[PDB]
Amino acid sequence: GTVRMNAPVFYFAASFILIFGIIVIAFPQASGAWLLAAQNWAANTVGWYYMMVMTLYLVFVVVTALSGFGKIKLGADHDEPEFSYLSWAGMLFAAGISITLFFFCVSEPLTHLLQPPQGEGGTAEAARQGMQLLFLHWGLHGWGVFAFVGMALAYFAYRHNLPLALRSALYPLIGKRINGPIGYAVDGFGIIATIFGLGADMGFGVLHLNSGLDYLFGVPHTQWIQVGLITLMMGAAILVAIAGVDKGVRVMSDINMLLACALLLFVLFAGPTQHLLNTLVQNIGDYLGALPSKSFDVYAYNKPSDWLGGWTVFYWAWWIAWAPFVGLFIARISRGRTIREFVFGVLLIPLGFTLAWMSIFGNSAIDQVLNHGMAALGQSAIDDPSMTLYLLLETYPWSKTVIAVTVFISFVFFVTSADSGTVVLSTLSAKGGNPDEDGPKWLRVFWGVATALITSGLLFSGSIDALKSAVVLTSLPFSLILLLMMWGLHKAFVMESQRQIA
Amino acid sequence: GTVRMNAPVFYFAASFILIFGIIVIAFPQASGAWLLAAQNWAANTVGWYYMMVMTLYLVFVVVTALSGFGKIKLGADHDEPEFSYLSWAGMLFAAGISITLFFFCVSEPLTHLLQPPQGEGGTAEAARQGMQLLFLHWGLHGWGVFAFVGMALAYFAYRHNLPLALRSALYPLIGKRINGPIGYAVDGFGIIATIFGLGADMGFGVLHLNSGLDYLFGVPHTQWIQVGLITLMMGAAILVAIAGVDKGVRVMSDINMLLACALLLFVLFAGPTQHLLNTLVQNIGDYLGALPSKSFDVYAYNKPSDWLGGWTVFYWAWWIAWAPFVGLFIARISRGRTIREFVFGVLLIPLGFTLAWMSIFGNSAIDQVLNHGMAALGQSAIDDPSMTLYLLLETYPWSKTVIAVTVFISFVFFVTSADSGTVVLSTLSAKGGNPDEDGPKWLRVFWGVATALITSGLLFSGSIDALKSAVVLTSLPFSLILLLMMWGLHKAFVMESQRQIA
Amino acid sequence: GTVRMNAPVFYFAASFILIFGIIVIAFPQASGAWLLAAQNWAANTVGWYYMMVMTLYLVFVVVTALSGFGKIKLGADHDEPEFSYLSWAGMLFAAGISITLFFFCVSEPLTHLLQPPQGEGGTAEAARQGMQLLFLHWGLHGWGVFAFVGMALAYFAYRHNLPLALRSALYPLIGKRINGPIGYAVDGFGIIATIFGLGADMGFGVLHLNSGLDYLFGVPHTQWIQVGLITLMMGAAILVAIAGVDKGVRVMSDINMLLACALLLFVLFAGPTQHLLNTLVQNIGDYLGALPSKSFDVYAYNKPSDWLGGWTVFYWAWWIAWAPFVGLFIARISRGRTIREFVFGVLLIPLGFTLAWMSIFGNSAIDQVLNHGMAALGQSAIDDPSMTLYLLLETYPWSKTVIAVTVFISFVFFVTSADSGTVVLSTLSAKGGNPDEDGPKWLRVFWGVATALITSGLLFSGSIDALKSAVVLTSLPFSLILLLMMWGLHKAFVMESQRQIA
């Protein structure tokens, strides 16, 4: 009949989050020690497992699209797409990228130059290796799991007339038991990872936004200021989701996506243009040359440390935690397309903007720390990673206008990403109605207030190292579910191949 | 009618072996000098040729299986396989691996660390490079020639109704002349290589077995002890081949293959587990990253030496010499399968166990020579490579029980490999009867006593450097025959492509 | 009706060349400074663009031949080839290779050893890196653009019944407007690049030929001697083109192509044969291992210099400038073949001879500068690159006969390449008649005298650095036309794919 709540999933997913969020708020000092102890345990005990499973998804989705299965339509064999490609291409940006592109664009390459994982720092191979780790952390591996989840969700819904849910890919394995205890756990385990990923993103955004106001006006860094920042950021995203406007939203996304390109072009043409163009091509070459061996590097013959638990394993856990939300969002606007076209669009359209942004913005700061002798900019990336971007931007013409534009652009990016997150969260916990509409409207408020509570709890207990620990701990049970879904999809493809010739 | 002897092949193959084996036994001092002189000549004169031809086989078999020819059945287009995959897979282990997996697992990586082919020894890149040479010597190159010979033998026998012989792949080139002087030389040249490969394997096994008894009881290393060891090892394998039991044999193989995994798991869980898991993933990454360039490395710009004639060219000659026996064994249990399924089973099922064994066992010893300061273990790999495994195993709990189990497991491995070798040897020199049965039973005894004689002659004249020289010298005329067979197979595939469209 | 002149193309292409050629002859001192200033500007401003576009052509032609489009015939689906493969294979040599193979074979690897682009010179990694740059500069990248132009020209002429011209590949974009102002500029811009490439080749040939006569007889290096050398070289190639003989020409080509192999075998067997064979395999391995990363190397993190504008960007501009002449020559003898067969013949038949020549001749000189202490041979590659080959050849048996043979072979190579250039140049500026015949005979004389004038002007103003600058400056507007042609070909392939299933 009508849409409603799926109680076995809601209660399971909501009793974990609300119990975790109170222990961290009532005991901030005991929680920051245990989360710091678990982060060093994970890097040494389950570090190889993440590196092993992140490559399987990419190899699977590439081999599938290059083979003869890339001819299968994502609907019936005679229906057509519903969007202009232009409107398809632009809807991937709004959901994929967020405010954390401003937090890591300058301070992360300056950290790998002064403290490399192997070698001696401050030289010319440290820079070449740091701009390569930066391409690895934002490249094909991350966009390859989004495409996997999206393809698996669209295939079982538009060809087999099954619900749009994570458990439908287990149908070739257990049949009608996707409506029992086994299928409800798969759906409850996929909400916890999403909540923790969104919380980490929102916490990094609060930290980035608190420094711009300090630079411009003089607002202090206080615990009661961050509460108001969280309130503003989340109340501006709940009221856009419960208001039922999509024209103004998708029209405002595109405006922000043009201002982003204007800012990128200003930064490119107001600096060393030829140096930046040369380093762009150099970085592309280095990444493609070292890809097949950097996928398994764990620095096993060096002296033991905990570098891996804060940089690469964190990134693999973070992309896995964001996969359920972006996959179900891209599956809804891809009916009528073939597998090859879908995969090669998702892998290459949002990646070219991200890698260009990262290259230009990181090389602009490396060039000024190495060649112009600006050491207070590189020392800031270690003690205060939230102020490095403004220290770089204050060396440009009309510096107090570019910063005021950057603050606004960054706020709008976060709003247009959180607004789409709450809708998908309310859909993953509903049941019934038409298989093209979203869940009830009282669940968006609930799943927004829950994320606000989690973020508030995790920042006031350990800052940046607590978010990275919670994500790595909570993304573990969903990787095995992804492997099971891969098995089910492979088992469906063989019945496809037999049925086309028999 | 009935099976019988193929006299033109038997006399040609038996007059070379019996004449070679008496000269070495009657003149042990003059034979050890000439075999040592030939080993340094070969490494410099025909070293590039082996590296050039070993890559052709692998590229051929991979491109064939990835193309549209991978759809062709290895029988008629409507018959089905005869085995359970489980029993097909387990039968590849029994024939492929032997007792020499215990002789090289610990002492070879410890040799590449203290005496690298390029660089300075005892450091942390010497270990990373040695564990990469070890993966190259036991990886895809060796299992890629087995698959080539097996596919070529099954194709011409189950689709064109030709004999199961090495000369049938020359039919598209010379027609009915495979039953004349040209086809008999091709079959006689393939028995000599097999005999010398088996002799080298048996000699390394005698050396490995003589040290365990010294460690346990106190048996000396004497020339009259090795004669009794050879007698026991070969008399235990002739009586299993002339007795006509396959249930008890294939059932005892599987028992030994479970004890091997139990021993591997004990060694993994009784040591530094996390270090070993990390180094496993690191080794996989390093091998896959350096594969396309290490295929042609001959160290040509360095100072001249003879490193290549004892390590890499020896391994290429040894795999080529073992190809005729394993190919005809795997061709008999693969009727009804497609080319792609056969190739991707043979390349990946027996390789994962071998590479895991090598990685775990080599890293366990590198970790204890570098980090725990055990120099008498690394000095033993240079002066006495037969005692290094026991020196490593004596640092574990209950050390005198694990060694007594290892000795037994190693003896059973050799027996289940030699038993299958003699049957195929008696088949390669027979003619007539049904094309699913084996040759007469008086030829198994003959080809076993011949191998015993060759091994006895080669050990008492130069020990380990004489076996490596004889193999490299006697595997030269069979590589050209393999190239001719590749030409014939390519010429048959084009007549396949037309007939499917005309 | 009959063939005639295409005046809008002729006047456009002939007013640029004749105006450029007089300014350089009337002002030799002011022209050598501006051409030297432009060479350093280009290396820094448009260096990344050439590296970016040269890889697109290769990736396009490889992916096209490996896909299902490699089955399309280059004519009608039922006609057969017209040549014997033997006469097809041999006609690619005569047009592809020229006299500049003798100018760079010895002096270029000796320059990269003593002045590497990165590192320290005179050691054993400088040699390994120089023999790798030499393989990059004469390998797959250059032969991959020839195949692209040839395939694009044959496809639109033998399947769609369009003229054999460069503008026919713009038909899917603008239709009947290929016979107006847009199509005439595309054809006029393709003659200027060809003229400048031919001029550079002829200038290097004059320099190489002037030193052999100095060595043999004692002819000085004078400005009035080079005028006579140019007169002889070009008058011997106009009289072969206006005489109408192809049997004697294609028959004399094959004779020269046998003398070349005889000379290569003499040089291989009169020196260190085993060292040379080992280094050949080593070079193949190094090139294939470093190919996917050396395609984007611009040395961006090193100290700024102008190395790129004289070595790699010059080579990319030179191959692009030679593409229009060789593409239209190979398109005329390839009717009836499939795309895959054409591409894999062009990529692999002329490349194996070139890479073997380069390897043997460069390693013969590296081995004698490093190991035998011959420093006057390596100092000559810096101050006088035209005399290095004779200094190397004078250390062989019967040295005054090999040099007299080399001079003749080099002269005949240039003649058989220029003779075919003038015919294609007269065809690119004609219109009418049968689409299998060549243009009028008064245009061959014109386009030969024009090249002579350009060469005379560019050598008397800056020698070797002026040719390299003119080529890099004049090959810029044709790369964009090549991109447009790629777009048109892709747009035609999709109408192929739809029409085979509908």
Ligand SMILES: C[N+](C)(C)CCO
């Ligand atoms: C926030 N992540 C980096 C995980 C994904 C961005 O789209």
Ligand SMILES: C[N+](C)(C)CCO
């Ligand atoms: C003994 N070889 C290494 C040659 C083959 C093992 O299957």
Ligand SMILES: C[N+](C)(C)CCO
């Ligand atoms: C002269 N180039 C090197 C440009 C081409 C030779 O065929």
